[PDB]
Design an enzyme around this catalytic site. Structure first.
Site, PDB file in Angstrom:
ATOM      1  N   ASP A  43       0.897  -1.256  -0.249  1.00 49.93           N
ATOM      2  CA  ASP A  43      -0.081  -0.010  -0.116  1.00 49.93           C
ATOM      3  C   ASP A  43       0.958   1.289  -0.021  1.00 49.93           C
ATOM      4  OD1 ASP A  43      -3.012   1.054   0.531  1.00 49.93           O
ATOM      5  OD2 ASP A  43      -1.689   2.182   1.781  1.00 49.93           O
ATOM      6  N   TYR A  48       3.053  10.145   0.824  1.00 51.01           N
ATOM      7  CA  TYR A  48       4.063   9.458   1.664  1.00 51.01           C
ATOM      8  C   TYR A  48       5.367   9.806   1.732  1.00 51.01           C
ATOM      9  CZ  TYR A  48       0.050   6.206   3.131  1.00 51.01           C
ATOM     10  OH  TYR A  48      -1.162   6.067   3.433  1.00 51.01           O
ATOM     11  N   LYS A  77      -2.401   6.493  -3.605  1.00 54.02           N
ATOM     12  CA  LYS A  77      -3.482   7.185  -3.536  1.00 54.02           C
ATOM     13  C   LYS A  77      -3.340   8.790  -4.089  1.00 54.02           C
ATOM     14  CE  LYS A  77      -4.188   4.885   0.932  1.00 54.02           C
ATOM     15  NZ  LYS A  77      -2.698   4.672   1.064  1.00 54.02           N
ATOM     16  N   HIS A 110      -7.400   9.839  -1.944  1.00 51.59           N
ATOM     17  CA  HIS A 110      -6.803   9.708  -0.315  1.00 51.59           C
ATOM     18  C   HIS A 110      -7.769  10.420   0.546  1.00 51.59           C
ATOM     19  CE1 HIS A 110      -2.846   9.242   1.799  1.00 51.59           C
ATOM     20  NE2 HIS A 110      -3.673   8.749   2.496  1.00 51.59           N
TER      21      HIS A 110
END
Ligand SMILES: NC(=O)c1ccc[n+]([C@@H]2O[C@H](COP(=O)([O-])OP(=O)(O)OC[C@H]3O[C@@H](n4cnc5c(N)ncnc54)[C@H](OP(=O)(O)O)[C@@H]3O)[C@@H](O)[C@H]2O)c1
Length: 315
Positions: A43, A48, A77, A110
């Protein structure tokens, strides 16, 4: 079951590796270990700032031939600051480049609330108020469906959506692709019974993140509930010759919910994957479900105002 059937008929490994907060200089090893330990579902997320490292690990395991692209289920996302037609495709292509892939198995919104463009995850004004945007997630969805028909995305999904927001998309005029998953916080203190029931009734799977109560999250007062320390869960874990974490993970599996525990610690990555050789009894699942308090560990105060704030609704 070791996987969940998506509405597209594709198989999604019921356990995957989470990467939120995984330092860039550690996530590469974490993904290699995860893949070596058996993970086939990774994932990821633009927000990130570590997709380049994830991609290096993947490329390497494929190079080694331990796995083929087809064996992996990669998730990423789209961040709300890129709902705009143009910025959206750029963010997607960039994600594809950073991960070094030709397609994603799953692309998720997201967060529902559109945000002001820029290199900021949460752009704020002079006061510190997060600048929202007029562009909606339905606007983004239409273009995301383009990615799907062009074969760059196998399936679309959402994250942190309440059932209303999902209803908005399922009943959108000219809908081409239905979301196959709603990725939300889920664990014993936040069982999500209604949302899970709602999603499943629509043929939509649920992906649980922060299955361990995310005892890492920056800024989390000392006397905050700890699922890994709870004696009742520890007791259940011990009877099955497993750890609490393995029980919290197995919990979701038996509810047919995908779970993505996160870790950069090789030993824990290994540990979180040993959850396919045991079964919690009906009573144990009830005991665990009975922990629910609708307590959210995630929750970002700065977002409580946003029109699309999803946590005010019942589910
Ligand atoms: N869409 C969203 O809004 C959203 C938000 C948050 C997270 N997520 C996703 O969900 C994944 C879940 O991660 P999370 O931080 O939310 O929470 P989590 O998986 O519940 O907990 C992660 C924390 O637990 C530790 N840990 C992992 N395995 C352990 C074990 N067996 N025993 C003891 N400690 C263990 C990790 O430490 P080490 O890393 O030090 O091992 C880390 O500090 C993320 O990586 C991300 O992909 C999505």
């Amino acid at each position: 079951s070791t996987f969940v059937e998506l509405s597209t008929k594709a198989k999604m490994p019921i356990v995957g590796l989470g990467t939120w907060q995984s330092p860039p200089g550690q996530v590469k090893e974490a993904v290699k270990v995860a893949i070596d330990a058996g993970y086939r579902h990774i994932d990821c997320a633009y927000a990130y700032y570590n997709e380049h490292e994830v991609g290096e690990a993947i490329q390497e395991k494929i190079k080694e031939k331990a796995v083929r692209r087809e064996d992996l289920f990669i998730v990423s996302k789209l961040w709300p600051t890129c709902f705009e037609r143009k910025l959206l495709k750029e963010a997607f292509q960039k994600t594809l480049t950073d991960l070094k892939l030709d397609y994603l198995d799953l692309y998720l919104i997201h967060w529902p609330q559109g945000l002001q463009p820029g290199k900021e995850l949460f752009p704020k004004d002079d006061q510190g108020n997060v600048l929202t945007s007029k562009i909606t997630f339905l606007d983004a969805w239409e273009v995301m469906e383009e990615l799907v028909d062009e074969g760059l995305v196998k399936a679309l999904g959402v994250s942190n959506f309440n059932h209303f927001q999902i209803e908005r998309i399922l009943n959108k005029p000219g809908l081409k692709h239905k979301p196959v998953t709603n990725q939300v916080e889920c664990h014993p203190y936040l069982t999500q019974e209604k949302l899970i029931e709602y999603c499943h009734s629509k043929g939509i799977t649920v992906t649980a993140y922060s299955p361990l109560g995310s005892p890492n999250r920056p800024w989390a007062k000392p006397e905050d509930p700890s699922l890994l320390e709870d004696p009742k869960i520890k007791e259940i874990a011990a009877k099955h010759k497993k750890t609490s974490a393995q029980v919290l993970i197995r919990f979701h599996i038996q509810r047919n919910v995908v779970v993505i525990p996160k870790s950069v610690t090789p030993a824990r990555i290994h540990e979180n994957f040993q959850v396919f050789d045991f079964q919690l009894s009906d009573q144990e699942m009830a005991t665990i479900l009975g922990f629910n308090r609708n307590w959210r560990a995630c929750l970002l105060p700065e977002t409580v105002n946003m029109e699309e704030y999803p946590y005010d609704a019942e589910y």
